[PDB]
Amino acid sequence: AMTGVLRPGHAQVRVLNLEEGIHFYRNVLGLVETGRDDQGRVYFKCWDERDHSCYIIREADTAGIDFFGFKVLDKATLEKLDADLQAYGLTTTRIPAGEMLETGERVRFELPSGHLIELYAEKTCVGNGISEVNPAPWNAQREHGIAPIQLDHCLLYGPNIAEVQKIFTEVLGFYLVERVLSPDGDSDMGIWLSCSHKVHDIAFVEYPEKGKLHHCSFLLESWEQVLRAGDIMSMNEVNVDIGPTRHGVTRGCTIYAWDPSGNRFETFMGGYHPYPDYEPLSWTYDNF
Amino acid sequence: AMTGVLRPGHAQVRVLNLEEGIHFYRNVLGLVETGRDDQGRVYFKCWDERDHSCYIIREADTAGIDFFGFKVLDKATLEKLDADLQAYGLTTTRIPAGEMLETGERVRFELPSGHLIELYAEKTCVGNGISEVNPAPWNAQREHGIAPIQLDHCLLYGPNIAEVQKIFTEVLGFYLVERVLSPDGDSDMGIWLSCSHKVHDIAFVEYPEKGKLHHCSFLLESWEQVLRAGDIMSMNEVNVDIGPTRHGVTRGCTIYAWDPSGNRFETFMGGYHPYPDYEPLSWTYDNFAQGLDYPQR
Amino acid sequence: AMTGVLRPGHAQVRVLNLEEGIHFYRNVLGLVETGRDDQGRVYFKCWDERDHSCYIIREADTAGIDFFGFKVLDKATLEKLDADLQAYGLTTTRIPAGEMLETGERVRFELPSGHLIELYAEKTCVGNGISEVNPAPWNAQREHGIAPIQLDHCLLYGPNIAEVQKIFTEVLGFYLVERVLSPDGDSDMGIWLSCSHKVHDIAFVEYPEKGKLHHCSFLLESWEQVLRAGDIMSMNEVNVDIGPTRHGVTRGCTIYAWDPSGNRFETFMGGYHPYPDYEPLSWTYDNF
Amino acid sequence: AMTGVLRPGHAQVRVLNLEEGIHFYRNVLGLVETGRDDQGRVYFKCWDERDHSCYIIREADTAGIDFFGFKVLDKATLEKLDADLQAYGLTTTRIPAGEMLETGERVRFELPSGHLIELYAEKTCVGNGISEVNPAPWNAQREHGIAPIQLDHCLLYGPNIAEVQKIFTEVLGFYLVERVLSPDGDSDMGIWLSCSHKVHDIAFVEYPEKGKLHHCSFLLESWEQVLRAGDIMSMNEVNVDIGPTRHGVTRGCTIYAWDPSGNRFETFMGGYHPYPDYEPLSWTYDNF
Ligand SMILES: [Fe+2]
Ligand SMILES: [Fe+2]
Ligand SMILES: [Fe+2]
Ligand SMILES: [Fe+2]
Structure with missing residues (x-):
């Protein structure tokens, strides 16, 4: 079984020019845009993934990463890890559900290397644009831009x-x-x-x-x-x-x-x- | 984290003729022969795997699979799984360590479909034929026969x-x-x-x-x-x-x-x-019904 | 050097439904449409070729091939092949220029096998959709349908x-x-x-x-x-x-x-x- | 049809050390060694080619190409080609057959760029190590070293x-x-x-x-x-x-x-x- 931390859930990067970033990622890399929030960020996910976002773009004075989060098995596993992370000696912060579009709350902390890391259990499952019954053999997103999986x-x-x-x-x-x-x-x-x-x-x-x-x-x-x-x-x-x-x-x-x-x-x-x-x-x- | 049951660990298949069985698997399929025991079973593993074996061949009157086993995280996970299989209602058999070359003890049991499944925590790690320090992406083994991963x-x-x-x-x-x-x-x-x-x-x-x-x-x-x-x-x-x-x-x-x-x-x-x-x-x-797994065709 | 008969130049095939054959070749096979004449024939070319056409579809009451033509190096070569075919004994038919869109005149003859074969030296070069200067290795055309070369x-x-x-x-x-x-x-x-x-x-x-x-x-x-x-x-x-x-x-x-x-x-x-x-x-x- | 100069026939290159060259081309590049003559040259051909050689190495003081020869359609094409070179203002040397193992006479001249070019019509067809009837779906030579075609x-x-x-x-x-x-x-x-x-x-x-x-x-x-x-x-x-x-x-x-x-x-x-x-x-x- 795959338990505890399951997989990388999302990276929220900083771009110098939003429009230029929206076009680049949407049309060159081929990520699929799923939403934009009143805070100015634009939400992107790989076409074959199932969750709402995996890469968020945000305008600011410098390039680099704001943070990197991972999805965990379930809510119980979220509190458990929160408690263990704290027990270990890290100060845990809890970004309320919804702060990010379609995303449950997440347990945030900072590493000794100085990176912001997140843990969340819930995030919307918009799917991959293919049927859940007899999914077709070919699909057009597959070839829009680079279109990573x-x-x-x-x-x-x-x-x-x-x-x-x-x-x-x-x-x-x-x-x-x-x-x-x-x-x-x-x-x-x-x-x-x-x-x-x-x-x-x-x-x-x-x-x-x-x-x-x-x-x-x-x-x-x-x-x-x-x-x-x-x-x-x-x-x-x-x-x-x-x-x-x-x-x-x-x-x-x-x-x-x-x-x-x-x-x-x-x-x-x-x-x-x-x-x-x-x-x-x-x-x-x-x-x- | 990968926990509990980890992955397919081995399948023991029945061959009508042991000699032609070893040539095909090692020369055509490309599996790596790793050992032969007293019962006359011959063991193999994909070149890129790390454990002693994943495919064991046994001579017999009938073709088919004797059993299929999964490797579990550790000894503790194994005793726990054995326990839960009991609690659910399945009877469990315990195969002693060494009964299979380089393998610890395994928990066996029959499914309602008739197949025997096994769980083990220990099996010797023999490596993938490649150095553990500054490893190349592959070696001559990747081109011996089909050479599955x-x-x-x-x-x-x-x-x-x-x-x-x-x-x-x-x-x-x-x-x-x-x-x-x-x-x-x-x-x-x-x-x-x-x-x-x-x-x-x-x-x-x-x-x-x-x-x-x-x-x-x-x-x-x-x-x-x-x-x-x-x-x-x-x-x-x-x-x-x-x-x-x-x-x-x-x-x-x-x-x-x-x-x-x-x-x-x-x-x-x-x-x-x-x-x-x-x-x-x-x-x-x-x-x-149009697929490759259809009982008919 | 490549001399005399150079390469297959075109195939003319019969389809029972014109418009149903058009959608297929342009959307499934991914050929590029280059034109349509008064006889109701529609022309196609693989995206990487340079000639106006390589495959022609004509509505008819029966499927099959009408003819298959090869392009030759030049007029001289075409007149020579025309003579050579006759000197062998084969009866030759001369189709006039423009009978086919953008196509010069062709030499047509029938084989013992019953098929018609054509030779032509001229057909307008329309290009492969990519520029003649600093050409990219391909473009969107390469991913529209199967899109053969x-x-x-x-x-x-x-x-x-x-x-x-x-x-x-x-x-x-x-x-x-x-x-x-x-x-x-x-x-x-x-x-x-x-x-x-x-x-x-x-x-x-x-x-x-x-x-x-x-x-x-x-x-x-x-x-x-x-x-x-x-x-x-x-x-x-x-x-x-x-x-x-x-x-x-x-x-x-x-x-x-x-x-x-x-x-x-x-x-x-x-x-x-x-x-x-x-x-x-x-x-x-x-x-x- | 392919007339005149058909394809690149062979390249003779100098190697500071025969033994290390013989190992590299034979075991790393994966060329098939076809022969060695009395002048110290060893012969190689690609496994899938058919002629006795495409690459010949010689032990010398420096590393460069001695000569590069092109195979032509036939002897008449060879005499034809040589005569037009001369009529062009290029002197042509005539290397007698046998000089190079399994290779017939060859016309050689020099370009204004200083390189030596050869032209020949004959070279022994050794084959590609696979049968001429029901050729096997694949051979072990195909995976011996890089093994170009x-x-x-x-x-x-x-x-x-x-x-x-x-x-x-x-x-x-x-x-x-x-x-x-x-x-x-x-x-x-x-x-x-x-x-x-x-x-x-x-x-x-x-x-x-x-x-x-x-x-x-x-x-x-x-x-x-x-x-x-x-x-x-x-x-x-x-x-x-x-x-x-x-x-x-x-x-x-x-x-x-x-x-x-x-x-x-x-x-x-x-x-x-x-x-x-x-x-x-x-x-x-x-x-x-
Ligand atoms: Fe990486
Ligand atoms: Fe399968
Ligand atoms: Fe074919
Ligand atoms: Fe090159």
Whole structure:
């Protein structure tokens, strides 16, 4: 069974120019817009997902991530984790239900790396636009823009990664799948964490600047859809970070590109299938 | 967090001839031979898996599946599941550790459909043939035969699927992802169950005969690998049931082929990502009647 | 250099319902419509080709093919082929320019198999919808329906293959790439002919009835696109002959499907790269 | 039909060390070793080609290309071609048959760009290691190393591209498919020439030094086989130049890597289907 924290639920990013962000994400990446709220944010979800949002856009003075939340099994599991997080030593805040459109209340806290993380149990299930009975074999959203299948994860840059990991593995029920060993002596300079059987649901890399966003990732269906996302990136003059390639760490076949506002995002596919009884894989710092 | 029942752990299948059985599986299917015991069972595992075995072959007079087992999180989860299966009403058998090469003890029990299912917490980790430090994405093994990535599931034919469903969802922590609705006077004619975020770890289709194994399934990296297995099956004059195709009742692109003994197997890739909070999808009987899992055809 | 007969240029097929055949080819197959003449024929071209047309549909009381034409290098070449065909003994018919929209004059003759074949040197180049300067690798057109890349060939059914092989090899400048051997008593049941370095530009199979059309063929980019074609066909209730599969006698990974009128067509990719100096491959009858 | 110059026949390149070259091309690139003569050259051909060789390496003081030969339709075409070169103002050397293993006489000349070009009509057809009757659906050779399907072309660096262009399109019956403009006072900083219906069998870029080799290219089956070439390269610790990506000029999805001696080679796939009746595509200097 999949219990406790189930999967990445949503990332709310900051954009410099709303209209430019709404067009980029809706028409280039191919996310499906589900709503806009009186606070100025626009709600987006991957076409094949079932919940109302997985990526929220918001205008502000700088690029970067406001926060990253995960959906948990149920409301009981929400209070339980709230209590454990507190018991651990973190100050928990409770954003009331509805503060976000179609979203129940969420338990928020801040990590030693300085990132804002959320936990919620309820969020509307608008579905994927396909019938629940004999779902058709083909659908048009599938090909609107890049059109990724799900918010896969995010990679964060922050200072106290060790304290970070203990929180996730000792309290949130994640496990280390991959890690990058320090140049020497000691710790991990990068950690890939999973709360399921995916290579990872979130990853953290050691860095001084607190709360920095490296990237939010979207899973694609094949290597060819990655080449395709590449072509669509050029057609739309999207600044690309690292063209299509393989990731030693994760084995992901990916493309790193930039938002019109500087936020790095990723469209990849590939990876093995780890489970909680697995020992993590490690990479020497010189190979990182 | 992945808890309780984790994943398909092994299937023990019956081959009419042990020798030709080892060649096909290791040379055509591409599974990795990992050991052979006193009873003369020969063990295999997909190259990318980490545990000693996922597929065990035993010589016999009849083809089919002896049993199908799931790996559970830990010893404590195992004793608990054993306990809950008792409390629900099923009788439990306890197989001693070592009875299977490199495996801890397992909890066995028969379903109302007749198939024997097993649960275990321990099985030796032998690795995936690749270094644990600075690992490459693959090695020569990925190109030995079809070389599937993992034992994905199995589909079984049995008489009391409504009860099997209850057992798997209420006791074992599985959830329904998809089903085939009754011809009209509704009920369920087929069920696809997941204990993870996979479309299904196991499936059952209503059927008179008890203990029927429709097929065991192995996951391939991509659609091209599926095309490649088809070329490999052709070359080895393997008897293919239904060539590469868009499955249907599961979104998988697959090939159903036969064992030299008559055991059907599946090489496929693709699927969506369901989670425990999702509601299942449904297929109307007529639609299903056109599918690959229909008792007829 | 590619000389004489260059490539399949057009196929004219009969449909029982004009407007019902139009929606299908433009929306299911995804061909691009380029025009409609007074005879009530409508023209199509794969999106990546440059010529005004490659497939023409005419309303008639019976399905099948009217003719199949090949484009040749130039007028000189066309007049030469015209003479050469007659010197072999074949009666030649000359169709005037503009008889077909945007098409120059063609040379038409009938084979022993009962099919009509055409040669033409001129047809307006309308382009592939992409610019001539700094062209992108593709555009929206590539994802409208199946959207094949080119009219690849056709397979014809007819009675005098031996003589048909003769004409193509000795008059038209083609060569045998592959052949299916007759049961034991050796002659040729099937014939795959090339006038380029493609596995084949046309193919014939010995059959007692004359002028029969087995299928016109359309090329896709990848196995992934063949799989996609299968999905689009399923979504549109297209009657599929034989599902996605690896055809031995060509290596192509294809799908045979049916037009709403009964005209079979194929979408496939793959094969090898043969040349005029290569000896042909052979298949035994049973294997066939 | 394919007449005149059919396709790229062979490339002889120099390797600082025979043994390491023999290992790389045989076991990493996956070329099939066909032979070795008394001058110290070892011979290779792609597994799927049919002729005895497409790539010949020699131990020398430097790394570059000695010569690159094109196969022609027949002997008459060879004499024909040689005579027109001379009538063009090019002296031609005549290498006697046998000189190169399993290879007949060959016409050789030099381009104004300093490179040596060969033309030949005969080379022993060894086959592709698969039967000529009921060819197997696949062989183990197909997965031995990267294992390209054919010597697709080569790109040369040298001066006076304009001169070379004209020899090719005016004497060898090649034609321009794509060009790269110069900033202004427009001439071609780069040209892509085809003598078939391939995007190109050869290309040249304006360079001060003459006789330079930029890279020899090998064709792959699909976008996934390239990613695979990527992985195999990494596994063998081969230095990769420009990671897997979409080209633009040719549309080819490729990866450039280096020889254990410095020669750049390529393994790609993809591209359209041009013919001699097509007008070349153009790229402004800014994109190049
Ligand atoms: Fe990532
Ligand atoms: Fe299955
Ligand atoms: Fe065909
Ligand atoms: Fe190239």
